[PDB]
Design an enzyme around this catalytic site. Structure first.
Site, PDB file in Angstrom:
ATOM      1  N   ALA A  39       0.863  -1.181   0.000  1.00 27.34           N
ATOM      2  CA  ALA A  39       0.000   0.000   0.000  1.00 27.34           C
ATOM      3  C   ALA A  39       0.900   1.232   0.000  1.00 27.34           C
ATOM      4  O   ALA A  39       2.124   1.109   0.110  1.00 27.34           O
ATOM      5  CB  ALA A  39      -0.903   0.006   1.231  1.00 27.34           C
ATOM      6  N   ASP A  40       0.294   2.411  -0.120  1.00 29.72           N
ATOM      7  CA  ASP A  40       1.061   3.644  -0.130  1.00 29.72           C
ATOM      8  C   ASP A  40       0.371   4.739   0.676  1.00 29.72           C
ATOM      9  O   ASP A  40      -0.761   4.577   1.131  1.00 29.72           O
ATOM     10  CB  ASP A  40       1.286   4.113  -1.572  1.00 29.72           C
ATOM     11  CG  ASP A  40       0.150   4.974  -2.100  1.00 29.72           C
ATOM     12  OD1 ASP A  40      -1.032   4.608  -1.910  1.00 29.72           O
ATOM     13  OD2 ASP A  40       0.440   6.022  -2.723  1.00 29.72           O
ATOM     14  N   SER A  41       1.076   5.853   0.837  1.00 28.54           N
ATOM     15  CA  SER A  41       0.596   7.008   1.583  1.00 28.54           C
ATOM     16  C   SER A  41      -0.890   7.324   1.359  1.00 28.54           C
ATOM     17  O   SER A  41      -1.629   7.573   2.320  1.00 28.54           O
ATOM     18  CB  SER A  41       1.467   8.236   1.242  1.00 28.54           C
ATOM     19  OG  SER A  41       1.661   8.397  -0.167  1.00 28.54           O
ATOM     20  N   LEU A  42      -1.330   7.297   0.102  1.00 27.28           N
ATOM     21  CA  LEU A  42      -2.719   7.605  -0.221  1.00 27.28           C
ATOM     22  C   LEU A  42      -3.642   6.407  -0.088  1.00 27.28           C
ATOM     23  O   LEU A  42      -4.850   6.557   0.125  1.00 27.28           O
ATOM     24  CB  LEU A  42      -2.810   8.178  -1.635  1.00 27.28           C
ATOM     25  CG  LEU A  42      -2.241   9.591  -1.792  1.00 27.28           C
ATOM     26  CD1 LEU A  42      -2.207   9.982  -3.268  1.00 27.28           C
ATOM     27  CD2 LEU A  42      -3.093  10.570  -0.975  1.00 27.28           C
ATOM     28  N   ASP A  43      -3.067   5.216  -0.222  1.00 25.67           N
ATOM     29  CA  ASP A  43      -3.831   3.976  -0.104  1.00 25.67           C
ATOM     30  C   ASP A  43      -4.461   3.950   1.264  1.00 25.67           C
ATOM     31  O   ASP A  43      -5.649   3.706   1.404  1.00 25.67           O
ATOM     32  CB  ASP A  43      -2.913   2.755  -0.242  1.00 25.67           C
ATOM     33  CG  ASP A  43      -2.659   2.368  -1.684  1.00 25.67           C
ATOM     34  OD1 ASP A  43      -1.725   1.569  -1.918  1.00 25.67           O
ATOM     35  OD2 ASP A  43      -3.395   2.854  -2.576  1.00 25.67           O
TER      36      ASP A  43
END
Length: 81
Positions: A39-43
């Protein structure tokens, strides 16, 4: 309790599973959104908003910013009704 805790954990587990396209098996209490779930910062922001709406809760940013593993969000969800 436990039975309800397992019910809740699963609830959240499923939301994370479909959202990040990962098998429920990988979504364990200690697994990490970024490191282990790709996942990522915005996920995570998408995920936090989804959970906030679904459960009708508001997770303060001071708390959200500390979410690393799924177990983290499970606890923060109780910390709000």
């Amino acid at each position: 309790a436990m039975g309800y805790l397992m019910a809740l954990f699963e609830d959240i587990q499923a939301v994370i599973a479909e959202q990040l396209n990962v098998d429920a098996a990988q979504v364990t209490p200690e697994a990490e959104f970024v490191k282990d779930l790709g996942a990522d910062s915005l996920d995570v922001v998408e995920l936090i908003m989804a959970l906030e709406e679904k459960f009708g809760i508001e997770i303060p940013d001071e708390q959200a910013e500390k979410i690393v593993n799924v177990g983290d969000v499970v606890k923060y969800i109780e910390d709000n009704k």
